[PDB]
Amino acid sequence: HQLNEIRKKYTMRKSTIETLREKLDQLKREARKDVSQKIKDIDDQIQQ
Amino acid sequence: SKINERKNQEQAIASYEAAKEELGLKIEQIAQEAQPIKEQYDSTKLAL
Known part of the structure; x- marks a missing residue:
């Protein structure tokens, strides 16, 4: 069971990298959305 | 997880x-140094 727990720790490391990948995906999505909104707002302010 | x-x-x-606290001290010192520049600008404008 300790060896199985070590395999579970490896799977948990894979879960942590999956959590990292989902966090990177959400971070990139929020970052692109905010940067696009900010660029549009800055362009609108510059046009005004 | x-x-x-x-x-x-x-x-x-x-x-x-931590960045906020250090940046607050930095902005405070920057404003303290900037105020004499504003005073010199006002004096120069009045002289001009």
Whole structure:
């Protein structure tokens, strides 16, 4: 069971990298959305 | 997994708070140095 727990720790490391990948995906999505909104707002302010 | 996510988020928040405190001191000193420049500009404008 300790060896199985070590395999579970490896799977948990894979879960942590999956959590990292989902966090990177959400971070990139929020970052692109905010940067696009900010660029549009800055362009609108510059046009005004 | 959620405790680890919260821990890294809390570490980022602590880094942001430390940056906020140091940046607040930096802006305070920058304003203190900038005020004489504004006074010199006003005196130069009045002389001109």
